Amino acid sequence: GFNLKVKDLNGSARGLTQAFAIGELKNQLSVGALQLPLQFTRTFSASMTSELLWEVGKGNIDPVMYARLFFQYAQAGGALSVDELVNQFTEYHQSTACNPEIWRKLTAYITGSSNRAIKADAVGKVPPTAILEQLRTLAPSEHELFHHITTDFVCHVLSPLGFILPDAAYVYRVGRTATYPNFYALVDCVRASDLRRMLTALSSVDSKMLQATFKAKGALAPALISQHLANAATTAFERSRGNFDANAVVSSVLTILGRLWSPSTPKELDPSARLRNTNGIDQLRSNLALFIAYQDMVKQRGRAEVIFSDEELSSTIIPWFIEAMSEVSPFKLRPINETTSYIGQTSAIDHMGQPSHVVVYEDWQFAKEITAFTPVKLANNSNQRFLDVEPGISDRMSATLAPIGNTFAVSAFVKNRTAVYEAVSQRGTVNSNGAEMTLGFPSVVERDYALDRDPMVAIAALRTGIVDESLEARASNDLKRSMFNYYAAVMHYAVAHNPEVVVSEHQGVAAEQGSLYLVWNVRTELRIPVGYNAIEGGSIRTPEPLEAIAYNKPIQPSEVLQAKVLDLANHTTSIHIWPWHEASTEFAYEDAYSVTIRNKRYTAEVKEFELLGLGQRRERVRILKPTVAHAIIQMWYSWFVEDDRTLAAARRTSRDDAEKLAIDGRRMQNAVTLLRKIEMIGTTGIGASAVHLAQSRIVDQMAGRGLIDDSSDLHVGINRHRIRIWAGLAVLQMMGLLSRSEAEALTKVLGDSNALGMVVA
Amino acid sequence: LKPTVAHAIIQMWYSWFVEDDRTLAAARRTSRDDAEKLAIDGRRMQNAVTLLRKIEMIGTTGIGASAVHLAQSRIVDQMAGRGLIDDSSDLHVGINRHRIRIWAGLAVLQMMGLLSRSEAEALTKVLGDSNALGMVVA
Amino acid sequence: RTAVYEAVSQRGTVNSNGAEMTLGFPSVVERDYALDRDPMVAIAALRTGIVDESLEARASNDLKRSMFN
Amino acid sequence: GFNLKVKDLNGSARGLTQAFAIGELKNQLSVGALQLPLQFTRTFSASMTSELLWEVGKGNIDPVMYARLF
Amino acid sequence: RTAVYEAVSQRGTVNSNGAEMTLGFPSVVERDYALDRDPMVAIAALRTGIVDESLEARASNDLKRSMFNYYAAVMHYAVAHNPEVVVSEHQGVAAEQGSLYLVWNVRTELRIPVGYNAIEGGSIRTPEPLEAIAYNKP
Amino acid sequence: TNGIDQLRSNLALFIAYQDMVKQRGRAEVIFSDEELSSTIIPWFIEAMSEVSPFKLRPINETTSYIGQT
């Protein structure tokens, strides 16, 4: 997790200001009043968890399926924007009519030189993909994907009444995707919708051509409708010359929505009553995270009012459509009440009783089991591979994670984190300007870390507010998405609490008063200073969502919070291949234990191995790291290094002996935290394996030199706890979770303190 | 006994395949004129594909499933005997499966008193270039 | 094989027949294979027509024993 | 008589591990969890010891004993 | 040998099992020694498990003729202690022709430096018959 | 059928299924029927025809020669 001050926050982390999204640049705080009331449809969203595997290649074909696939592909960062995927796709099937030969040759597969026409059909369907790999020689395909696409028309079932088999399909694993959207994500949505406008007609045409085909004869003679097949689809491809223009339409519905927001009356911003109605927008005004997307792209690209729309006809064609009313996005529009709620609340009491520890937190049970893949490549001799799930490290390590599936529950974490509770004297005097604002989400880490980037750098970029901006455009991307997902998540969750919101320019640089933020209100909070407001008027009135967050009364989490976890043995006997890599290849790696007693080096040196007790190596497998399982413990890692370096900065600053007592107790209580945690980690059964076996090895080392064979001399007290960590080290790296540069940290922190048991055991 | 009849059928089938692939291969060798070559080489494929399919019916449906069974036994036990069963995923897919299956139906066919043995090696010789791919299994 | 016929275009036709096309007799095979003589050798013997005089009362004439049928 | 490790018995007397009675080897040592219970009860008895002569003898012929003999 | 147990101190225990300890069957010896086959060779054959394929109808199978009984041994007194049962068919990835043995929850002491299946929780469940005895009273 | 259920009680002959899949594989009932069997065949099972050292008994007596320390 992670925390801020309650009074200050901009001096703690600029990223959660509305102002930073507004690009206010640290200076003046937003406050400007003169307000317009709102309401909630609790706003459009995504899913949150959707780990599943589509079938393709079975010849059913449905654009909504592929839309997810390309969308996920960009979410894999396989190229970049979906829009790029699409323009490059059209660049691909600019091999459109310039290649009649696609028909002439696939029909040649139908056998062929079909001027020798007849009810020729016999058998063969399901792998034109290879003869179409010859079509890849005809249609080179640096991407696997569209090459894997085009097969379908000839072989969805065509000719639907024979050809014939498949008895086989294909594969891909969509994972859960991004939680909340943005400019690029949206244009990717509507772009995916132009593709939606593509493929469905592309199926329907053939769907009727087949009706007009088997005139009988039987399937009738070729070099015709077959030789047709998709020429009409090419015309359908030419029906696709003009959907819209994604950035323009998105910017359009955007800024017109903003005009619907802004106080600014005049003709530049006068949403016509001629069209203030007309469906959709009437609830679409209510969406609010979508509104965050507004202020976001308003932040990046100014406003750039192309206003492709008129005032009414047609201010209709442009908002004919948008992403939620697309199914093309994994993301989906959202009903009324729950918003996206699933976080409880508690708050510190000094019997006064203003909070000093805000408690806002997670809600999430991590995977109970994970399974290794055996990369049995054989077909194609390239990317094509089979994984064949089988038990291995799997079952046993999983059962060992079950206790971790208890003792590292988030509820227990925050509950202990809440137990930090009493601090700076007593009791009853803990208050002093700011107060800690602890928080964190399952999502931001589960995704940004899934991209393999280490979220904490972005987190710190938020903490300083200002972007490091030295990153690769890829990392530039992960940073951006990190930002608006943090921010917006906090926004619309905070919104999920407080019922009412009002629009607020800002002013400052105006830059034409279109720039704007929000201010909120609640009353129940006790007459105490809190944030800039205090509470002022018996009511909040704050720009800043965190402020409304702090005042909220304690509650409970709602969502099923489960990791759901994938399975695939079915699809595995089916596979085939897909962009899978990221796992990656060789399931684990050794870590080397060491210790000294009687002033002698020993170095236990253990692998990897199954370690569990059946050799050897194994080999080969690789298991996926759960995003979640490492993400959560990384939240805590962020806490560890947080209290470490920051309160060490306190060790540097306030040299007051009482403040000395504070840094003492706090750093040494995170110390007792990881202490007792690894402590319970050592009792784990694999931990038991590491204990007995590594101890067996170094006892064998005792037998090395003949005089230090004088029985065990390690065991007294300190050594046991001292090696107890080693169990937490196997549980660390190559348990499939922690990423090293970690035990590193833990080592230094375990050096920071006396540790000991500290008692128990 | 030494059952008759069927021998003539399967032989005719065998030799006629010989006529088949000879003709088609010559056709692609020159005829000439692309529109036809892919046709025949396309044709070629499903011909083999056709036989592929029917060969499973020869076997893994009574009683050559016993054959693949025992083959799996002997091979994995051989893995253990040479030591590692480590690499032995080989109860799995296609290539090995086409291998063992076609071998199986062909094998019970060997136990069938008709078609010798040369026909077997020639047959797998046929499928081997053609493609094999599928993945029809399953 | 009938299906093979369309392979390979295009039409000849005078320059080279025509074809046997026709025989593939189950009967002729079984008649000889019953004695496990292997008919297939007898086949070419009808290609050239003349018997290759494998002088043995259960060799040569048996070939001819088929040819009649 | 002989000996073998308990944890490593599959790496040891691998045939004796009952999982071997099935073709199982795998990354996994059989098992998992599932369902239907009933102690399988009443085993066929003790053929050990109980050695004795029998008489074929009479032509009155008992097939039964002769079977046992077969 | 029981007396040997105190040799040699001191306590391990996790680093290296555990031990067979258990078998020394008069029965398995006599069953084979009656044919003067010498059981002792069959013994190692169950060490590696796989038969060494001494191909002869009164050689190889006779080894296996014992091995069956050998399995047949433990299961029976794996009945008493405990009537715990089932287990599943264990299809794995290949191949579901059926594959279901038996399981034994028994009941246990709360420590498990014995059995890879840590499943101490109340008791072992358990995948293999011997562990029951391993957790059994004398 | 007033007997095969006694076999439901004779489930001691377990392991037979084990090697059955192992010695062989799929266990198709092939002469299955559905009336049969039932009907006669399980009735016609050996132990009830009692040849052999096939032997028959309750539980532990066979175990009643197991040492334990």
Residue numbers in the entry:
A (entry chain B): 1 to 761
B (entry chain A): 624 to 761
C (entry chain A): 417 to 485
D (entry chain A): 1 to 70
E (entry chain A): 417 to 554
F (entry chain A): 278 to 346
Question: Which passages does the manuscript contain on this structure?
Answer:
Here, we present a general computational method termed ‘localized reconstruction' for solving structures of symmetry-mismatched parts of macromolecular complexes. The method allows symmetry-mismatched and/or flexible subunits to be treated as isolated single particles separate from the rest of the complex, facilitating their classification, refinement and reconstruction. To demonstrate how localized reconstruction can be used to address symmetry-mismatched components, we focused on the RNA-dependent RNA polymerase of bacteriophage φ6.
We apply the method to two published cryo-EM data sets, namely unfixed COPII cages and the VP4 spikes of triple-layered rotavirus particles, in addition to an unpublished data set of polymerase complexes of double-stranded RNA bacteriophage φ6. Others have previously located the RNA-dependent RNA polymerase under the fivefold symmetry positions in the rotavirus and under the threefold symmetry positions in bacteriophage φ6 polymerase complex using conventional icosahedral reconstruction. Such an approach applies incorrect symmetry to the symmetry-mismatched structures, such as the polymerase in these studies. The main requirement is that the macromolecular complex is amenable to single particle averaging and that its orientations can be reliably determined first.
